[PDB]
Amino acid sequence: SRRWFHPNITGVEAENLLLTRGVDGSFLARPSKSNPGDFTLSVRRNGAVTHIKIQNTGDYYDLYGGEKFATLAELVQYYMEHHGQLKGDVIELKYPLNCADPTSERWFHGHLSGKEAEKLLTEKGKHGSFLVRESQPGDFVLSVRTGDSKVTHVMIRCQELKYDVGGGERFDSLTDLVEHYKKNPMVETLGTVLQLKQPLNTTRINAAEIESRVRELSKLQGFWEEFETLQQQECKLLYSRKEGQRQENKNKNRYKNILPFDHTRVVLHDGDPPVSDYINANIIMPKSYIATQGCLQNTVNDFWRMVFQENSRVIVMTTKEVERGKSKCVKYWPDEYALKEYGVMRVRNVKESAAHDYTLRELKLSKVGQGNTERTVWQYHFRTWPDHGVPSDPGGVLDFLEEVHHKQESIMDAGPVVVHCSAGIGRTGTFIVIDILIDIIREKGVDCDIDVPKTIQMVRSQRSGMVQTEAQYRFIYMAVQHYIETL
Ligand SMILES: Cn1c(N2CCC(C)(N)CC2)nc2[nH]nc(-c3cccc(Cl)c3Cl)c2c1=O
């Protein structure tokens, strides 16, 4: 349930909603109208409404007078289970004020004719594939596919702000109606059970026709709607992050609330003979990756223990050490030609090679007191990503990725590619998803199916909030487009 997020409301609409339909402790979140890319958390307290700014430049959600989070749902879950934390006065998030607007649902298709929706369910649908469109006069149509085959249309009437299928219950939202008939399916007179198994997949595109999709997603934007429908699916990804919350592990996190999932975290087995198994890092399985945060002075040894145990031969750094006067990642590698020890691990910097968009460092890693453990580790340091937003052209990112890929393909039995930035979720997620998408187009060529949100969602179940902003989302499409056009 992420119903507390209203995508199409102004600050004034939000104020009236919380005053007339809410109580003290009532809250909602919404996208900013005065500055796109920002969010507002509106809370009712002592009869008055407080508007709290949330910012996302692409690394994390930064709440004003609060903490840094991987997702809006992780933010809201934290403040609803940690009172007295949001402020002089304490602001309590007690009651989420639900949104009835169906615009961010995977099944809602707004304007769509009966023939067009039937063409979509006939060409793309399967058993249980459904969608909801606007009639065809203020009413709605639920269109479902059944078989292994036919298409049924269930009329949905909007009467006095309530929704119904002809008889029975009247629902406050189309969502409450859809969720009801998902659990208890409508049975036709002659035995057909109208199972609402999955929403109709319309995001899956053929690689060769990316330029067509990008053109449409750019029309009044379509990119904003597809991304917001993906954000609404983040409430299904609140997996436990217990290990990261342990007292002994707290100072091993760059941002106390951006934690690895327990089910995919990297477990370190080197073990200095109390709590030596932790790193803020996750395994990302589509060639594998490891997504991690930028080192802290106290986590550099753990970082090399990870690289060594995982047999990784390639590291992708997507940040400068220092950005906007803030430490983003500590320097975990020696100076060129220098040799250094990071606990039981030894690193030599053999050669540094500068290119326009990046530096390549040839590092040799080994365990101290064991010469035959030596292996070359290639460090790809991308240096030209802007402090805010994304590069305006994907060429540089694409050339860099093409080079990282060839290095990784040339090494036999290379472990996962290590990818990091600051919190290890924004730029990191962006690099991994482009890399996953372009890998499909490598083996299967131009005549293959690519599904950007399905890929992001799959990467997000392995690490919280991978791909942070709408701009990164649009950058993923632009990069895939450029790759297919330069083939
Ligand atoms: C159909 N669909 C739309 N649509 C439909 C209706 C529309 C015209 N209103 C806008 C675009 N957007 C989306 N974004 N993400 C997804 C998505 C895809 C696969 C897995 C997961 Cl988990 C997600 Cl979330 C998704 C989606 O399925």
Domain residue limits, the chain = 1-104, 105-199, 200-487
Is 100 one of the annotated binding-site residues?
no
Which of the 8 DSSP states describes residue 295?
P
Q: Whose CA is nearest to atom 6 of ligand 1?
A: 109
Question: What method was applied to determine this entry?
Answer: X-ray
Q: Whose CA is nearest to atom 27 of ligand 1?
A: 106
Q: Is 421 a catalytic residue?
A: yes
Write down the CATH number for the domain with range 105-199: 3.30.505.10
State which of 226, 237, 467 you would mutate to test the pocket of ligand 1, scoring each by most atoms of that ligand within 8 A of its C-beta. 226
Atom of ligand 1 nearest to the CA of 227: 14
CA 80 to chain centre: 22
Closest CA to 177 of 192, 187, 166: 166
Is 139 one of the annotated binding-site residues?
no
Atom of ligand 1 nearest to the CA of 200: 1
Is 422 one of the annotated binding-site residues?
yes
Closest CA to 404 of 426, 429, 382: 382
- 3-state SS class at 167: coil
In the reported structure, the alpha carbon of residue 106 is separated from the centroid of ligand 1 by a whole-number distance in angstroms of 4
Closest CA to 71 of 224, 198, 241: 241
Beta strands in 33-139 (DSSP E): 38-45, 48-55, 61-63, 68-69, 95-96, 129-134
Q: Which residues line ligand 1 (CB under 6 A)?
A: 106, 108-110, 199, 201-203, 225-226, 229-230, 233, 453-454, 457
Q: Which of 99, 235, 295, 421 is catalytic?
A: 421
Atom of ligand 1 nearest to the CA of 112: 8
Q: Whose CA is nearest to atom 9 of ligand 1?
A: 109
Atom of ligand 1 nearest to the CA of 222: 10
Domains 1-104 and 200-487 share a fold: no
Is 305 one of the annotated binding-site residues?
no
Closest CA to 309 of 264, 341, 277, 262: 277
CA-to-CA distance for 438 and 433, rounded, in angstroms? 8
State which of 106, 132, 473 you would mutate to test the pocket of ligand 1, scoring each by most atoms of that ligand within 8 A of its C-beta. 106
Please tell me the CATH superfamily of domain 200-487, with its number. Protein tyrosine phosphatase superfamily (3.90.190.10)
CA distances, 11 to each of 64, 104, 168, 275 (Å): 17, 19, 36, 47
Long-range CB contacts for residues 168-174, cutoff 8 Å, separation at least 24: 172/100, 173/98, 173/100, 173/101, 173/102, 174/100, 174/102, 174/105, 174/108, 174/132, 174/140
CB 209 within 8 A of CB 143: no
Is 295 one of the annotated binding-site residues?
no
In the reported structure, the alpha carbon of residue 121 is separated from the centroid of ligand 1 by a whole-number distance in angstroms of 15
Q: Which two tokens stand for residue 359?
A: 């530096």
Closest CA to 280 of 272, 290, 270: 290
State which of 200, 229, 437, 458 you would mutate to test the pocket of ligand 1, scoring each by most atoms of that ligand within 8 A of its C-beta. 229
In the reported structure, the alpha carbon of residue 334 is separated from the centroid of ligand 1 by a whole-number distance in angstroms of 46
Q: Entry resolution in angstroms?
A: 2.3
Burial class of 24 by CB neighbour count within 10 A (0 to 12, 13 to 18, 19+): middle
CB 217 within 8 A of CB 440: no
Q: Which two tokens stand for residue 98?
A: 């639900």
CA-to-CA distance for 4 and 14, rounded, in angstroms? 11
Phi, psi of 317 (to 5 degrees): -100, 120
H/E stretch holding 215? helix 210-217
CB 380 within 8 A of CB 318: no
CA distances, 51 to each of 30, 39, 54, 92, 329 (Å): 10, 10, 10, 13, 33
Q: What class has domain 1-104? A: alpha beta
CA-to-CA distance for 8 and 1, rounded, in angstroms? 18
Q: Whose CA is nearest to atom 12 of ligand 1?
A: 226
In the reported structure, the alpha carbon of residue 252 is separated from the centroid of ligand 1 by a whole-number distance in angstroms of 36
In the reported structure, the alpha carbon of residue 239 is separated from the centroid of ligand 1 by a whole-number distance in angstroms of 22
Interior angle at CA 249, CA 245 and CA 254, nearest 5: 85
> Could you please report the per-residue DSSP string of 441-487?
HHHS-SSSEE-HHHHHHHHHTTSTTSS-SHHHHHHHHHHHHHHHHT-
State which of 103, 140, 230, 455 you would mutate to test the pocket of ligand 1, scoring each by most atoms of that ligand within 8 A of its C-beta. 230
In the reported structure, the alpha carbon of residue 216 is separated from the centroid of ligand 1 by a whole-number distance in angstroms of 14
Q: Helix, strand, coil: what percent of the chain each, to 5?
A: 30, 25, 45
In the reported structure, the alpha carbon of residue 225 is separated from the centroid of ligand 1 by a whole-number distance in angstroms of 8
